[PDB]
Ligand binder design. Structure first.
Ligand SMILES: [Zn+2]
Ligand SMILES: [Zn+2]
Ligand SMILES: [Zn+2]
Ligand SMILES: [Zn+2]
Length: 215
RNA sequence: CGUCGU
């Protein structure tokens, strides 16, 4: 029960993804023990890839509401502050309607349910930016397929993601979806990078979503 | 002027 957090912390320390070989070069287990532990926690915690790689993930999500009334089993926090980027950490302190206490008692309890309470703020941020689609740039609501040319402000090119929103939440079931499931697209990667997500992070998001899509 | 906003 405590071994899973141990692994996650190391994965989160190394960008959220490590090869199985490189993982073994950090721990005191033979490959047989490690590999059977990853399978146990399941793909909602560790996504396994083909050399072999492991991608860290979690079901834990940040509440999307501006103001939320309990009950709610999501984390409640300022994403910006978690990333250390909220400009209202010092000067106003108010005018940010979101919690700057990452490890609040309500949050600590959510973290417990997802077996993440041993994580520091940096690891938690690493895990969430690649697991919680709420940390992604806005997805274009008018986008309808790459065989169209819809009004995303033609004279001012769309600054939003043109991908399938259902895919990002692991819920695309459309037989022959027309919306892109390809996050590694050049223009997507640019918006992603502008938003603070490197191509390495997007690749992890891509692989987590792919795993969820191949249900 | 689309959520988290010098
Ligand atoms: Zn909530
Ligand atoms: Zn804030
Ligand atoms: Zn668009
Ligand atoms: Zn889709």
């Amino acid at each position: 029960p405590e071994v899973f957090c141990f692994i996650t912390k190391i994965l989160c320390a190394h960008g959220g993804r490590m090869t199985l070989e490189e993982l073994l070069g950090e721990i005191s287990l033979p490959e047989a023990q490690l590999y059977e532990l990853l399978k146990a926690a399941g793909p909602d915690r560790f996504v396994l890839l083909e050399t072999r790689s492991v991608v860290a993930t979690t079901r834990a999500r940040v509440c999307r509401r501006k103001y939320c009334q309990r009950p709610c089993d999501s984390l409640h926090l300022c994403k910006l502050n978690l990333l250390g980027r909220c400009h209202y950490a010092q000067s106003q302190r108010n005018l940010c309607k979101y919690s700057h206490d990452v490890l609040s008692e309500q949050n600590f309890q959510v973290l417990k349910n997802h077996e993440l309470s041993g994580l520091n703020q940096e690891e938690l941020a690493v895990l969430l930016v690649q697991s919680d689609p709420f940390f992604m740039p806005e997805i274009c609501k008018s986008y309808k397929g790459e065989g169209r040319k819809q009004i995303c402000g033609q004279p001012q090119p769309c600054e939003r993601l043109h991908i399938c929103e259902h895919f990002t939440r692991g819920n695309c079931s459309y037989l022959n979806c027309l919306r892109s499931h390809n996050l590694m697209d050049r223009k997507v990667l640019a918006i992603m990078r502008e938003h603070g997500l490197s191509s390495d992070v997007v690749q992890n998001i891509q692989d987590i979503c792919n795993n969820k899509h191949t249900r």
